Amino acid sequence: KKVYTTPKKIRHKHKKVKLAVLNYYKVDDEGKVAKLRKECPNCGPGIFLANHGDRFYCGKCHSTFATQK
Amino acid sequence: ATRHVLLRQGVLGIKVKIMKDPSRNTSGPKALPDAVTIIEPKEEEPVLEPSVKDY
RNA sequence: ACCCACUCGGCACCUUACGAGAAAUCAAAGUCUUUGGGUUCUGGGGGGAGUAUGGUCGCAAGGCUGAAACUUAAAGGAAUUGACGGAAGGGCACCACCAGGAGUGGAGCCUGCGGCUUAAUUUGACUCAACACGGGGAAACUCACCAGGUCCAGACACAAUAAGGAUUGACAGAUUGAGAGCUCUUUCUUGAUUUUGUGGGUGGUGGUGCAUGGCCGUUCUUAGUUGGUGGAGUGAUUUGUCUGCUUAAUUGCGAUAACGAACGAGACCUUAACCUACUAAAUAGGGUUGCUGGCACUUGCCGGUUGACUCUUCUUAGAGGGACUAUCGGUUUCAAGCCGAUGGAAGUUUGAGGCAAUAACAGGUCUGUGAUGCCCUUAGACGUUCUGGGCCGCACGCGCGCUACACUGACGGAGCCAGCGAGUACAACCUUGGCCGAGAGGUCUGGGUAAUCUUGUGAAACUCCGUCGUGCUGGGGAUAGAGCAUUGUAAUUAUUGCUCUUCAACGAGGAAUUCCUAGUAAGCGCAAGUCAUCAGCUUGCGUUGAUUACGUCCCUGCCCUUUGUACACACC
Ligand SMILES: [Mg+2]
Ligand SMILES: [Mg+2]
Ligand SMILES: [Mg+2]
Ligand SMILES: [Mg+2]
Ligand SMILES: [Mg+2]
Ligand SMILES: [Mg+2]
Ligand SMILES: [Mg+2]
Ligand SMILES: [Mg+2]
Ligand SMILES: [Mg+2]
Ligand SMILES: [Mg+2]
Ligand SMILES: [Mg+2]
Ligand SMILES: [Mg+2]
Ligand SMILES: [Mg+2]
Ligand SMILES: [Mg+2]
Ligand SMILES: [Mg+2]
Ligand SMILES: [Zn+2]
Numbered sequence: 001k002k003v004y005t006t007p008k009k010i011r012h013k014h015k016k017v018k019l020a021v022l023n024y025y026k027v028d029d030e031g032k033v034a035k036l037r038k039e040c041p042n043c044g045p046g047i048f049l050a051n052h053g054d055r056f057y058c059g060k061c062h063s064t065f066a067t068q069k
Numbered sequence: 070a071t072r073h074v075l076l077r078q079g080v081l082g083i084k085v086k087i088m089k090d091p092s093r094n095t096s097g098p099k100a101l102p103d104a105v106t107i108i109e110p111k112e113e114e115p116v117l118e119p120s121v122k123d124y
Numbered sequence: 125a126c127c128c129a130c131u132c133g134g135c136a137c138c139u140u141a142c143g144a145g146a147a148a149u150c151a152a153a154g155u156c157u158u159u160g161g162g163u164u165c166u167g168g169g170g171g172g173a174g175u176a177u178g179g180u181c182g183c184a185a186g187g188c189u190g191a192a193a194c195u196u197a198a199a200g201g202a203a204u205u206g207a208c209g210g211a212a213g214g215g216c217a218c219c220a221c222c223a224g225g226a227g228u229g230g231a232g233c234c235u236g237c238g239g240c241u242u243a244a245u246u247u248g249a250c251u252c253a254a255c256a257c258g259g260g261g262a263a264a265c266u267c268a269c270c271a272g273g274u275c276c277a278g279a280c281a282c283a284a285u286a287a288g289g290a291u292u293g294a295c296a297g298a299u300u301g302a303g304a305g306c307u308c309u310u311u312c313u314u315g316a317u318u319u320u321g322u323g324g325g326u327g328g329u330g331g332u333g334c335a336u337g338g339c340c341g342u343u344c345u346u347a348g349u350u351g352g353u354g355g356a357g358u359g360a361u362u363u364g365u366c367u368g369c370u371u372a373a374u375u376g377c378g379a380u381a382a383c384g385a386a387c388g389a390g391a392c393c394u395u396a397a398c399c400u401a402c403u404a405a406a407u408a409g410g411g412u413u414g415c416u417g418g419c420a421c422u423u424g425c426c427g428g429u430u431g432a433c434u435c436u437u438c439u440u441a442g443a444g445g446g447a448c449u450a451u452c453g454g455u456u457u458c459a460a461g462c463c464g465a466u467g468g469a470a471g472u473u474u475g476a477g478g479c480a481a482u483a484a485c486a487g488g489u490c491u492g493u494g495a496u497g498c499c500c501u502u503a504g505a506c507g508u509u510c511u512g513g514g515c516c517g518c519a520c521g522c523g524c525g526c527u528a529c530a531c532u533g534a535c536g537g538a539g540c541c542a543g544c545g546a547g548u549a550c551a552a553c554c555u556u557g558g559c560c561g562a563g564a565g566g567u568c569u570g571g572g573u574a575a576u577c578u579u580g581u582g583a584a585a586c587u588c589c590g591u592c593g594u595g596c597u598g599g600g601g602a603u604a605g606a607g608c609a610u611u612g613u614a615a616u617u618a619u620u621g622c623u624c625u626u627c628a629a630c631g632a633g634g635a636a637u638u639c640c641u642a643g644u645a646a647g648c649g650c651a652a653g654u655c656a657u658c659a660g661c662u663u664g665c666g667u668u669g670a671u672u673a674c675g676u677c678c679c680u681g682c683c684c685u686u687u688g689u690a691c692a693c694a695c696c
Pocket of ligand 12: 524
């Protein structure tokens with residue numbers, strides 16, 4: 001065979017930067033709950049939005065929002 | 070019937086040929102087509118008078 | 125001077141050897157392990173070496189005489205089978221040659237392979253038996269090559285995080301060839317699938333066909349191959365398997381230490397040839413007749429209709445037969461057979477293939493292969509996958525091919541007859557008929573999963589009447605420009621078609637050498653194969669259809685046979 005090329009730069013799959021208890025939602029009293037951000041309009045509650053500078057997208061429906069909140 | 074087979078050292082080239090007997094072949098001819106087998110003849114008695122035999 | 129018989133002396137042959145001998149052979153090389161007639165001489169693996177030395181002899185050359193050290197596993201002899209031989213006879217074959225044909229090589233163009241070039245122009249194959257081959261006509265794919273990126277397709281085993289996440293995803297623009305989350309900008313998803321290591325694998329058009337299998341090719345479709353007894357030899361072996369004549373053939377006659385056998389050849393098989401003799405048909409074709417179109421106009425001629433009735437010549441295609449060199453003539457030991465007439469569809473093994481032995485070859489294939497050994501590799505993968513290229517580049521070498529160098533023509537019309545084929549329902553196949561378009565090609569509609577429709581595939585070359593007449597001319601179409609089509613996601617490095625224009629080389633090709641003996645060669649086209657699209661390619665098919673042998677060993681090759689052979693990895 002002929003020799004291989006070798007530019008240099010290699011790109012690996014990102015490790016993701018995992019995190020737990022992360023870090024939305026709150027409770028002031030104890031019993032009741034006080035949701036932060038919002039839940040999904042399309043799917044049922046339990047799934048939450050993603051808050052950026054006037055841009056949102058969900059996870060269960062890959063990336064399907066548009067309107068602000 | 071050919072069949073490739075291992076072993077560990079390399080692949081072995083088995084072939085097998087079995088010339089089946091014509092008599093027990095059934096399908097096709099019951100004989101190899103060059104094989105001509107002539108039957109035995111049968112004897113008779115010449116003359117013994119012209120003779121007859123009525124009913 | 126013979127003949128004939130026998131004899132002392134000389135020089136040599138034949139057969140059996142029962143005697144010798146390793147055998148070749150030998151009536152001596154016999155009378156030798158059943159060892160002794162007499163005598164002289166020489167040799168003790170090969171070399172070193174007939175050398176060194178010393179004599180001794182010679183004019184000298186040289187002779188006679190004659191070492192070891194060292195070296196080495198064989199050196200020989202004879203024969204056996206091979207292989208080989210610029211040895212000799214005897215065969216065979218248009219992959220040999222004649223007698224001819226068609227050519228190719230020249231011309232242009234395709235298309236192989238060199239060579240050069242390139243980032244890559246991927247490689248295999250190099251006398252027949254590499255070179256229009258890899259079913260290899262590559263636009264990407266294919267793809268192995270190169271420039272770039274992506275992906276894990278990292279089986280399982282054991283451990284480190286084990287939810288205070290193991291890790292999966294990810295629009296927006298910069299990023300990036302790029303609505304590749306390829307990522308760095310991000311801060312939302314995902315729930316133990318995995319990811320980090322170490323064993324271990326998996327894949328790899330990586331490597332080695334000189335590690336192999338299968339298949340193929342090639343010796344060779346040549347006529348060769350083998351054994352069982354029996355003989356000859358100690359034996360390897362051999363004879364059988366051969367002086368001749370035949371055959372396409374080790375095919376047979378025949379002669380014969382061989383007899384009868386098998387393999388291969390043949391037989392066989394498939395196909396192509398013949399059937400007014402069967403069995404059969406509105407998916408094959410005809411006859412009468414109905415309706416119905418036209419004619420001449422008498423009754424007659426052509427039709428068109430799946431209206432009826434019936435038939436099987438053609439057609440298919442079953443089942444049979446048929447050819448056996450048959451009959452006659454010569455000709456040949458009046459054998460095997462060959463040669464000529466007659467008839468007969470068939471008288472070339474009737475034509476063609478299909479299979480095709482022994483033994484092999486370091487032929488070719490690791491790029492058909494989850495056929496594969498072992499070296500490679502195994503996440504920056506030589507894996508995979510996308511994206512663009514590249515195999516097609518050109519001073520130039522050869523190799524199949526095509527088109528022509530015209531008047532046996534070219535161009536117009538007109539006439540107008542084939543066969544093999546092949547073809548879609550989960551796709552997009554063959555695609556008539558009707559309209560549009562100079563074309564190509566669109567479109568509606570069908571028929572067809574096919575002796576039914578495409579399709580009589582009314583294919584071409586041909587045949588007729590005209591235009592030009594032997595001028596690089598209307599021959600010849602290459603190179604070019606522009607457009608109009610079609611395939612596909614994508615056509616520039618024209619995919620192909622069509623349009624008009626360009627009109628180059630080339631007035632039958634040197635040395636060479638290919639193919640060929642009958643429905644063949646040569647011409648012509650069709651056809652499937654590959655194919656979305658491309659035919660100069662190819663395996664089939666049918667059309668037109670000669671010339672010239674119907675022999676020979678002159679060349680080439682091969683084969684035996686005898687001979688030789690310091691060869692046996694076998695003339696590299
Ligand atoms: Mg590379
Ligand atoms: Mg010695
Ligand atoms: Mg082709
Ligand atoms: Mg192409
Ligand atoms: Mg593969
Ligand atoms: Mg014997
Ligand atoms: Mg022999
Ligand atoms: Mg034949
Ligand atoms: Mg080999
Ligand atoms: Mg491999
Ligand atoms: Mg090529
Ligand atoms: Mg060829
Ligand atoms: Mg048809
Ligand atoms: Mg001109
Ligand atoms: Mg040959
Ligand atoms: Zn959503």
